[PDB]
Structure 1
C-alpha cells in the first residue's frame, strides 16, 4: 500500500511506502474529497490535514 503526495504550493511530488497497517487505520473507510488529519505518518507529519 503506497502513498503519492503532491504539494500544490510549489508543484513537487514524491511517493512514500507505508508497510505498517497501524499507520493506515485513520485512512480507511473514507470517501473522496474529504479532509483527513494525517497525524500518524511520522514525527515531522504532526499537524497535517490531507
Structure 2
C-alpha cells in the first residue's frame, strides 16, 4: 500500500510506501473526509492528525 501524503500549508506532497498492516489498521474501517491520528505510523508521525481525502482501488 502507498500513501499520497500532502501538506497544503506548504505543498510538497510526497509518497510513503507502508507495508506493515499494523500501521494501516488505524486507517481501516473509515470513510473519506475523516480525520484520524497518524500516531500508529511510528514516532515520527506523533502529534499529527490527517484527513483521508481519497485514494485509488487495487485496479486503479
Q: CA deviation at 1:42?
A: 1.7
Normalised by the size of structure 1, how large is the TM-score? 0.91
Normalised by the size of structure 2, how large is the TM-score? 0.77
TM superposition outliers: structure 1 runs of 4+ over 4 Å: none
More helix by share: 2
- Structure 1: any 5+ residue segments left out of the alignment? none
- Structure 2: any 5+ residue segments left out of the alignment? 51-60
Give the whole-Å Cα distance in 1 for the aligned partners of 2:42 and 2:15: 15
Partner of 2:24: 24
Partner of 1:35: 35
Q: Helix, strand or coil: the match of 1:4?
A: strand
